Amino acid sequence: TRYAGKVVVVTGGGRGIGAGIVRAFVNSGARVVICDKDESGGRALEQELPGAVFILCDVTQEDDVKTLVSETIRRFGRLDCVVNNAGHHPPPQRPEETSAQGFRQLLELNLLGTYTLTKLALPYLRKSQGNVINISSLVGAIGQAQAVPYVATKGAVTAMTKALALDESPYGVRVNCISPGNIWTPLWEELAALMPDPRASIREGMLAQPLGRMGQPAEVGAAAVFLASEANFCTGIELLVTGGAELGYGCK
Amino acid sequence: TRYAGKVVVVTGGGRGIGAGIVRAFVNSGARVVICDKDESGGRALEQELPGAVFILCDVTQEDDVKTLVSETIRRFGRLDCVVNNAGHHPPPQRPEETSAQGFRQLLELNLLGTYTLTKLALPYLRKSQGNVINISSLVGAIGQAQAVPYVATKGAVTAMTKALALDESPYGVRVNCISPGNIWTPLWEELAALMPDPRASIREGMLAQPLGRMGQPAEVGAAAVFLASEANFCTGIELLVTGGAELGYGCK
Amino acid sequence: TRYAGKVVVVTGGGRGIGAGIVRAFVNSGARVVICDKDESGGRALEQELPGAVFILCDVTQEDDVKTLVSETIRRFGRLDCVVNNAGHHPPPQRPEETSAQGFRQLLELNLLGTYTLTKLALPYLRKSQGNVINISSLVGAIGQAQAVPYVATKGAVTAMTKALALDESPYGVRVNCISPGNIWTPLWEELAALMPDPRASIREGMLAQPLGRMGQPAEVGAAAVFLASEANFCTGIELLVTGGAELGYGCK
Amino acid sequence: TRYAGKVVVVTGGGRGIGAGIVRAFVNSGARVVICDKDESGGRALEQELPGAVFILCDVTQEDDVKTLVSETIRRFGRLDCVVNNAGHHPPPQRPEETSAQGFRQLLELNLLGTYTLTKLALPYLRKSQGNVINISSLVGAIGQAQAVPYVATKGAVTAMTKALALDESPYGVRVNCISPGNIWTPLWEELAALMPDPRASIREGMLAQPLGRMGQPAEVGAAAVFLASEANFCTGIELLVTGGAELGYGCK
Ligand SMILES: NC(=O)c1ccc[n+]([C@@H]2O[C@H](COP(=O)([O-])OP(=O)(O)OC[C@H]3O[C@@H](n4cnc5c(N)ncnc54)[C@H](O)[C@@H]3O)[C@@H](O)[C@H]2O)c1
Ligand SMILES: NC(=O)c1ccc[n+]([C@@H]2O[C@H](COP(=O)([O-])OP(=O)(O)OC[C@H]3O[C@@H](n4cnc5c(N)ncnc54)[C@H](O)[C@@H]3O)[C@@H](O)[C@H]2O)c1
Ligand SMILES: NC(=O)c1ccc[n+]([C@@H]2O[C@H](COP(=O)([O-])OP(=O)(O)OC[C@H]3O[C@@H](n4cnc5c(N)ncnc54)[C@H](O)[C@@H]3O)[C@@H](O)[C@H]2O)c1
Ligand SMILES: NC(=O)c1ccc[n+]([C@@H]2O[C@H](COP(=O)([O-])OP(=O)(O)OC[C@H]3O[C@@H](n4cnc5c(N)ncnc54)[C@H](O)[C@@H]3O)[C@@H](O)[C@H]2O)c1
Ligand SMILES: OC[C@H]1O[C@@H](O)[C@H](O)[C@@H](O)[C@@H]1O
Ligand SMILES: OC[C@H]1O[C@@H](O)[C@H](O)[C@@H](O)[C@@H]1O
Ligand SMILES: OC[C@H]1O[C@@H](O)[C@H](O)[C@@H](O)[C@@H]1O
Ligand SMILES: OC[C@H]1O[C@@H](O)[C@H](O)[C@@H](O)[C@@H]1O
Ligand SMILES: Oc1c(F)ccc(Cl)c1F
Ligand SMILES: Oc1c(F)ccc(Cl)c1F
Ligand SMILES: Oc1c(F)ccc(Cl)c1F
Ligand SMILES: Oc1c(F)ccc(Cl)c1F
Numbered sequence A, B, C, D: 001t002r003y004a005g006k007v008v009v010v011t012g013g014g015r016g017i018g019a020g021i022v023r024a025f026v027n028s029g030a031r032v033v034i035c036d037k038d039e040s041g042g043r044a045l046e047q048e049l050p051g052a053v054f055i056l057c058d059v060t061q062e063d064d065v066k067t068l069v070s071e072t073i074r075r076f077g078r079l080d081c082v083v084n085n086a087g088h089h090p091p092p093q094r095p096e097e098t099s100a101q102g103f104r105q106l107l108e109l110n111l112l113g114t115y116t117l118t119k120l121a122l123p124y125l126r127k128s129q130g131n132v133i134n135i136s137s138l139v140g141a142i143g144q145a146q147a148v149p150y151v152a153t154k155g156a157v158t159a160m161t162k163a164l165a166l167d168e169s170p171y172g173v174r175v176n177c178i179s180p181g182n183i184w185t186p187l188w189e190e191l192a193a194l195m196p197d198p199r200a201s202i203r204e205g206m207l208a209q210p211l212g213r214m215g216q217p218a219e220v221g222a223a224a225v226f227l228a229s230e231a232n233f234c235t236g237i238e239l240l241v242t243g244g245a246e247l248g249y250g251c252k
């Protein structure tokens, strides 16, 4: 009952971190709208969790997002929290292998999709004194190799979170982001599968953290519920969920 | 029941932020040992809250701290979380009005007291896979005027938190800190009372945050319970509880 | 003679910060290619400074940028440093007054133009063990009110700087950024002119810094020459040129 | 002639980073007072460099520091820059192997010695519109294993730098710090000699940086001359001289 009576939209909530965030909010008492461009995971999640419903939505399509917000209000009558989790990490790419075209397409998902849903949701979040939670990445803050477009998109998300927090503070709407490090998700597994030695890639990813393991979607989910339900004096913060990967010296 | 069956020590828990942290852990199901050098607030808190007990302890006295840990184990049989909140902010002091003597005494409370209890507690925290929460300050990160010794002590606490997180990660013991901004406490009120216009000082402190208010001990307390009970992939982080004071341009 | 025999390209070098950076490199002994989309300032600068030449180039046009690099090599035979300074700050805009369209156009100048020139220049920078200097902004790090798209673009630039520094480090090519705060430029003056009271806006901007003044293009220029010529162990850093605006509490 | 006619005091200037900073300022045209507790390196440096003189001074002894300032004024008539470089990194120590006693002694050198000279020098720095440069460490910001007291002292130095910058800004006195990463010095070599395999320790230290090498005292020296002579809009900044060690993921 930490977030009972509240309505939450989670983009990319069909699998991975997003699904962990969906489950955490449902466990907190909220009703959750699962937004995803793929039907498979989200539809099954809606059958599994009472209180969660699935709405097909590609956050890069402005009309999809308009319909997502209006359907959320029509079906549930309020909107308290938007979790902008939809995003993608391309396979490793040397800077000379990247293109302005691919960069624009990644900006469209990782940054403008977050911008568009937030914009459409804010009138309702103002009515509810709701809040926005953006899922950025640690590599937005510290960089990463062979990921220039991805890193740039998460740098923008983290900075945009702070700008929006300033604009919305007079209306009592908080805007925060979570920066996960290595979290074991289908995306991580897919990316590891492309490497010459997948098992070696995964063990390298585990040892990137002083804790010696990757994180779980449920741990990102707990951080999100905290920001929504108990962080009333937090706005514009970047909550690190990284297992300490940013600490100390390492083999670079 | 988020932290049921767990045992928490809170230093400086007799009033202010520490008392808010005590109440939050008790509300989470934990048993809490209130450590304070002053009897008045802590003893009343123990009478008020079942599950909380008061132990007189000056964290600058190594034998006081040794007795605090041994009494906690003797009476409760385990130790899961240490919250190093004891600390003091002197009145405003121009750098030429400070002294090496006063600097050393402030280091003794704000930094070495935290170091001493953490050291004595870590053998028991390792047994429990417990965690350490240090209460630092936003001004450790961004500086503050007329507070050179205070700022230095909180810079050390925040850095020490990261060093300790690295050392204790192989043992599964997490070490994190909370950096509050302006929180309305008896200390803030006492400090405002020394100003020529106390009400003007307080309104200036409120407007330092884009949220337009100071924070509450209960909000620091919620952040502490989160770090202890639900932040299992967080170590070495600095959790800002500041109302956004660090964001954007201001009259400096 | 600190940077004698070296060849530097400065985008947006016709006025403002870019012109200050041009002058600083010329004063250091380098030959400088001034890139700008407007002829007026850049052409006059080329007449004024021996060693500086002006090449008309809109960094949002990929063929313009291709021609800029090839003409630089054809005329000067090497390329040692690229300063990505072209950029624009729109007038204040509430988040609900922004558009995805305007956001994309600002990304095209502030981020993709930097990405495009850097990409085309890197083969030559690798030959010279040259370096990249991106002009970002303090508000990328701390946010700003009524500037969501602008803040996001500078957050991306600062993060991209770190990602690129990692990719190019094996080749001895350093990538750094400068984050200016309030610098008195034609852009600042133009923006102040739109305010109801321009003089009040300017005095507010001066007092945003503990130093009590805005910065000068020449001071950004000195920081750029340092990064190019004397910072051989610096890569991926964000050099703040802000007069301390990020320090301490302020009226927010 | 970048800093001609100026007078600089460098503590711990007899070897290592301090000696590199001495040489850089002498090369810039300044007169430099070398302060060190050991006679060997400093006296030889004074014989080698016209314009540099050696004054025996232990920065932990307040009367030594008083005499250092008064002798500097008596012999050279002004004081423009103080570089607080004296400091020590103990051998690796697990947290349970540290002591409050050793912690206090390290605070006395790494933090209070910097505080004491800065305090005694500020009246003269105000007359000259001079500046303060503190040598902190990257591990103050990101932590380090087996170095809890050391990390805490550098966290304090970096924070104190910002507090002092705020206090001294109305007087036109800038206060900045440099945070080096792994720099090859006699201290690094001494520490490596204590390891079971010194050569393995050194190669690990080199690979901690994406640049693949450690830094040089001369590179720290160039950064110091920049801050003193050309960074007139920089105050309270932390200038990283780390070869990118803080960037990206590493084996932790
Ligand atoms: N996995 C990690 O280690 C990690 C670390 C840091 C940040 N992140 C971020 O976390 C978020 C989720 O990552 P993940 O690992 O769970 O990925 P994932 O690929 O496992 O899941 C992402 C989900 O988003 C959906 N999605 C993708 N594009 C969409 C679109 N246009 N509209 C709607 N839904 C869309 C996908 O269908 C999928 O269900 C991303 O923003 C990612 O950048 C991940
Ligand atoms: N109040 C704020 O705005 C603010 C902001 C940032 C950080 N902080 C930090 O929060 C902590 C608590 O601050 P507060 O405002 O609640 O202060 P407070 O003065 O209201 O309460 C501090 C408590 O600690 C106790 N204490 C002091 N010295 C002690 C010692 N030697 N041994 C044991 N207990 C001791 C006091 O008796 C008191 O009960 C401090 O570490 C302070 O630096 C406060
Ligand atoms: N002025 C400040 O206070 C401040 C603070 C932080 C960051 N910045 C950044 O500094 C940079 C320069 O700012 P400024 O104040 O000097 O601005 P300015 O408007 O005075 O000058 C910018 C110059 O870039 C040119 N330019 C614009 N679009 C271009 C394009 N497509 N191709 C080529 N040239 C183009 C303009 O013609 C102009 O000559 C920008 O990146 C800005 O974001 C400025
Ligand atoms: N070497 C590195 O990789 C590194 C990295 C980051 C920060 N640092 C910092 O740089 C500074 C210099 O380090 P280094 O590697 O050159 O060390 P070093 O041991 O080689 O030289 C330090 C010098 O300071 C002197 N000194 C020590 N105690 C003193 C005292 N009480 N009074 C006066 N002089 C005293 C020593 O005699 C010596 O000449 C220190 O503050 C250190 O923490 C070093
Ligand atoms: O596919 C890799 C991991 O992704 C996570 O989202 C799932 O919760 C796990 O069951 C799975 O092991
Ligand atoms: O004294 C100022 C404030 O301090 C806080 O710790 C208390 O919870 C408040 O009741 C009080 O208003
Ligand atoms: O237009 C405002 C300022 O812009 C700067 O780029 C110029 O160097 C100044 O001469 C001018 O005062
Ligand atoms: O002793 C290790 C290194 O220390 C530096 O201060 C010296 O300049 C070098 O000559 C030496 O190789
Ligand atoms: O942002 C990240 C990251 F930091 C590490 C791995 C993946 Cl798959 C990501 F998407
Ligand atoms: O650390 C702080 C702070 F940031 C503001 C006010 C007080 Cl009373 C403190 F102790
Ligand atoms: O980036 C900035 C800033 F921080 C202040 C003012 C202007 Cl005009 C900018 F472009
Ligand atoms: O501060 C540091 C560091 F970051 C690395 C090595 C040494 Cl010897 C130091 F003193």
Ligand code: NA
Pocket: A045, A046, A047, A048, A049, A050, A051, A052, A053
């Ligand atoms: Na359901």
Ligand code: NA
Pocket: B045, B046, B047, B048, B049, B050, B051, B052, B053
């Ligand atoms: Na009780």
Ligand code: NA
Pocket: C045, C046, C047, C048, C049, C050, C051, C052, C053
């Ligand atoms: Na010319």
Ligand code: NA
Pocket: D045, D046, D047, D048, D049, D050, D051, D052, D053
């Ligand atoms: Na000499």
